[PDB]
Amino acid sequence: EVLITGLRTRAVNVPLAYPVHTAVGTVGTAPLVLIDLATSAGVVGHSYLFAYTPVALKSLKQLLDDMAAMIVNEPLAPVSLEAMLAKRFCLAGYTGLIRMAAAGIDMAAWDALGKVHETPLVKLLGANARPVQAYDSHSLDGVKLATERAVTAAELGFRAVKTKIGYPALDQDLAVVRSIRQAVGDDFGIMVDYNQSLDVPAAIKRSQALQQEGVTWIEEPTLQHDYEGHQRIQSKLNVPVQMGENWLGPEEMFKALSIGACRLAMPDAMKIGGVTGWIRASALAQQFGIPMSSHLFQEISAHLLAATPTAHWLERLDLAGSVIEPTLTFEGGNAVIPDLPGVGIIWREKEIGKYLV
Amino acid sequence: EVLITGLRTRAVNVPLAYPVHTAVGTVGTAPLVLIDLATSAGVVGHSYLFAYTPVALKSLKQLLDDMAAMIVNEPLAPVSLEAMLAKRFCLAGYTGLIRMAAAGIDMAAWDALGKVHETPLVKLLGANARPVQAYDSHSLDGVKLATERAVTAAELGFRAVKTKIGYPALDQDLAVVRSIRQAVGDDFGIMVDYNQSLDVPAAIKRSQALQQEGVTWIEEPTLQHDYEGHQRIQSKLNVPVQMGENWLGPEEMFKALSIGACRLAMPDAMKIGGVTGWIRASALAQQFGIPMSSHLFQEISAHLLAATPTAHWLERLDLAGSVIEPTLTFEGGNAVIPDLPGVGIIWREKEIGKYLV
Amino acid sequence: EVLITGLRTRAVNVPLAYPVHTAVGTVGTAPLVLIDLATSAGVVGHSYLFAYTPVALKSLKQLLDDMAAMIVNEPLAPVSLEAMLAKRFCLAGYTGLIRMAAAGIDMAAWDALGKVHETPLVKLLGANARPVQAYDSHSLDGVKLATERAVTAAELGFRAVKTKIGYPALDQDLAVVRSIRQAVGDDFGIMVDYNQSLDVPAAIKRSQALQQEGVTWIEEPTLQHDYEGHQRIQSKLNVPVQMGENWLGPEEMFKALSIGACRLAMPDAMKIGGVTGWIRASALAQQFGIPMSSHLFQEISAHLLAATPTAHWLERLDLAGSVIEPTLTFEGGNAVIPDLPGVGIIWREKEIGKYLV
Amino acid sequence: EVLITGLRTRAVNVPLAYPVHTAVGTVGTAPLVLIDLATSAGVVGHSYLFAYTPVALKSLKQLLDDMAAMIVNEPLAPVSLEAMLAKRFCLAGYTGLIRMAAAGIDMAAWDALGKVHETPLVKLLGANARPVQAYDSHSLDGVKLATERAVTAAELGFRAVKTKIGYPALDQDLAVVRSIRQAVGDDFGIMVDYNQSLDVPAAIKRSQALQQEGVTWIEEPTLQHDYEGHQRIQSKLNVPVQMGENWLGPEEMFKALSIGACRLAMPDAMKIGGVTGWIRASALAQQFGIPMSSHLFQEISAHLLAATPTAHWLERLDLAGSVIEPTLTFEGGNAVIPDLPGVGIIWREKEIGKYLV
């Protein structure tokens, strides 16, 4: 009855006001693939995918364009569609770029389903819209800029910031955290992210020094696939270890949670499998007793977290702000879901043409 | 915006053509509580609860009637409602009759949400309607009646039956299974259910003899809360152990699956927490690799199983057939979801008055 | 020979001098069901059940009244009666309100057995009456009232108080504990109860700060059914984690103790299964090496704890003081068992009529 | 000193004499990306990648072409190159198509290193060339064609065949195996592959029936990422469970072997990370005591298996035979490594132009 009639993709590369510098490399621009999922009902679903590096941008677009044939004329039924794609990529490997591609379709299909029923996505999933606390995510900025950005964030009403650490010396890590604490006061949340840059002995040593400084969480201290190593670091700390932005699908989350790799989780809406993957992940987090935050995709995450039983923090990191209307607002540090059908993503078409690849 | 405006309940006690005789007692009639959830949008959600024994019928109705005050004027948002009820019964014990009461509300609220959007529940959950294979569930009927009912079931197109066993002697258990096999042929599925009547040594002994007869699964061989004892029985069998009809909420399922209590699961839509509890349970079954069947509530289960990744069998046991229209059909042994908004439950009002308690 | 001849129940709702405010809600009045179990020997057994909220009061009474038929004309043999009820509710779910109902009968049946033999219950169970240390249980009262109530309690001879915590900020939790310590001195026991209000990371953080303040125990820091999460909190503390008021039956206690969820236990006489459930629970606590305290039902708990090998503290929280005679006394902080047959519960009939629902 | 000077890729789609039909889909043609890695020493390294489906072919080529910039002017040092690529894709996800891309480069770089030193790759890795037993891999061919292909394979000197199974009924699985056994005699190896098509209960049931038929191994009975489910199937069998073709990198192998998922391993040279990933995987297989076979890439696998301590079988499945010279020979069922520098891959240029995409 409602059928998918087309898939259109546009690759853009948008410059970011502050490049996301990390201990393992810098994301200087946002390579995005903007997806339009056409339906027989006359509504168009919208989502975007983040390619992390320009190196993978054209390849991701191409993969989606070649995938268009297997979803056209399929019912607009995202759970059924996801099962069909899992099965079609069974032999090839339903992970990495292929999984991310599938999640893009999923997110657009749920946005389109929300538009067919004229209802915000959070209400379609059976929950009420509520304000979700958000933290402002910054990068490996050095002491001076890190302190300047955190003071701006408190002035805009955010009650917590995430800074990136993993400097050559632990004393630089501490200097950044202390200067931020000096400027914003002891009430403020300071999350820290190592972006997988430390081996386990180094991570235990540096994390116990940061724990004395009173940080909110320590994020991805070592290689993301090493769940066992994260469990080993977590067992030596009182502060929570946070991870999850790199889990491809709920099955990777399930393996990490099964061994006690972390006390907090933050799935990425794209890598976890879109809305369909997020519903499954929230059921896992609930049963393992894990507070669940988001990573990127702040527009759809505001919706998914209001439907998440152990919802913890929304990560504010506006990668797509230049190409979409500001319908998601931040008021007093909380994200406010737009009262719009679907996810509330509305392209700024004249701006997109400026970044087209 | 859509608000719950009222809750009306009616307790009925319906005589069953064949009483469900089990090794631990007989369900002679179906004690049901039929729920009408009124909304500000002018649609009325419908669900029913099964009380198992007339002893608990009036108490369950009363509990629901006293609960009416905490949900009236709440938004019709079943995930948010469920979280509020979990929290309101935090001190008292969010389990047993209270949980079952909450699930009744949930099922009615999702039926009403489906009616607000004019869509079958399965399509609201993001899946396509598909035919779900069903088995006919019979009872501890003795050799002659068990064989007569299984032959009728094959004639109606069912490709599997469940019989209840747990007779004084193992040789009576085997005689029933063998006579059914003789009559319906070696292709047919014969599920067997012990209804918690055996201790673990007895269950290992009787199950290994039944396994040589080639049964489809062995259901609840010992006390349902003894997950460890079920794991012990399962480790001595090649045939799967089936359980789950008695789990109150996905947290009980999570404990049983975590220790490997069974190779198959069959949540009860009421005891697992309604639609909201079923979505969480299907995410668990998927990650633990457990084929998931249903127990009772065949009308809503046809919908929930089409949205369940490891969906296995629908249990046909028509407890409410006298008071609701036959919109769910069985064709060639498969349940066919009605193309009706919500769940497709339509009361037969003149019949209800005949059974009112 | 001694037969049960009748069961009479009365629901009352008694206002409490101090409402029990907790972090997850307030128990403003005591909804009680007072049970009279008539026997052929001419003695009447007495017990009461606590319904936690008025919402479940009439339903609990109704359930007991409908259950009356299965116990009338049964021998006054509480272990045999309990096995019969476990078996009769096998299919339905021998937990929640049904289990609590069964425990009410059990407690009344043991009180009646004590009256048939003219002996205090503790002596019927084979033990000597001894004074049991008791703590006074208070609620989420804020700094000023919490300090006022603790000073009154020391003046009445209690050597320990339990306060409820779980305020929005940890600093409010600490302020309450510190002001109480300031007023009553460093010798005094300060137990703290979170009433399941924290997630595991939050509970580890807040509990390690309270541990530095020197609290006696930390009670139910997270959701009560999450035994694994309690084990995780307990492994990060030197102070004991206390729980158990919400275990329905010794089988739930057995699961929690098997995984090391807590270092202390405090079964509720009603939820654990009455006297018959308490004897089984004390055998479990003894073998796992768990000091065992009580939750509510201070009249029968004074008796059961004198028969409990690892008996630790009696919780004084007088919910039924308005409707029963003060035969249980507190002398120098110890509960003194009355030298009366059975449990020593004697209704104040003119007062009951004031609270009848 | 030896520097990489360029990377050239060509995508071809080659028709296969027998399409590889499996229980989860058919690989009708071989979508390949042929890689030429130019060096400053004037030798050109060669490798190819298998894309499984035409849907991912152009995307894989594009990814490699965009990756060319990060390896040009790097030393021809494959272990150092691999570490740099792991680090460059740290944030993005060093798995799926990106990992496969990196492995293509690795295989070409080791072929080029072998050409710089004028030595066959196996001798560069420190081992002697030896004949490696090979089995002929067939597909889900039905009884008649499966028997015809196995008889041809015995006539060509192969002493074992792999057939694909996973037919609707177990009786079709058995019929295929029995007819092959009838035709080739009881000495012959019959491997069977389910290609992830069964859930765990079904896999235990079907595998125990196949075990009575005397099959050599049972390959990927359930979803490949479900290591725990494979462990569960393996614990119920005497016959070995075989898997590994889908592990992306030695870290996935390490997780599966750590839990005892299988008794045999067969890494895919591309998915495991090329030569550099294969050396690491062989060290793992040796210490866990796992006989190690290969999956596809028969030209480089003949070399890697002669250097593998627990080397078991080479899989003969000639996907690239139309575009490369037949330098690898099969004599008496054994693969014979060519006495050529590097891997021994020599393009048939006029044929490539016929399949260019």
Ligand SMILES: *C[C@@](O)(C(=O)O)c1ccccc1
């Ligand atoms: C059939 C297969 O699993 C094998 O050879 O083991 C395979 C899977 C994908 C492509 C080729 C072969």
Ligand SMILES: *C[C@@](O)(C(=O)O)c1ccccc1
């Ligand atoms: C406050 C409590 O947890 C306790 O006394 O430990 C409690 C909970 C419900 C009712 C009364 C008391």
Ligand SMILES: *C[C@@](O)(C(=O)O)c1ccccc1
């Ligand atoms: C018989 C039963 O266990 C089943 O259908 O599996 C059942 C138990 C209680 C009520 C109805 C059916």
Ligand SMILES: *C[C@@](O)(C(=O)O)c1ccccc1
């Ligand atoms: C910095 C990061 O880890 C985070 O926000 O947590 C990140 C990683 C890749 C891209 C964006 C952000």
Ligand SMILES: [Mg+2]
């Ligand atoms: Mg991060």
Ligand SMILES: [Mg+2]
């Ligand atoms: Mg059953």
Ligand SMILES: [Mg+2]
């Ligand atoms: Mg308490």
Ligand SMILES: [Mg+2]
């Ligand atoms: Mg294979």
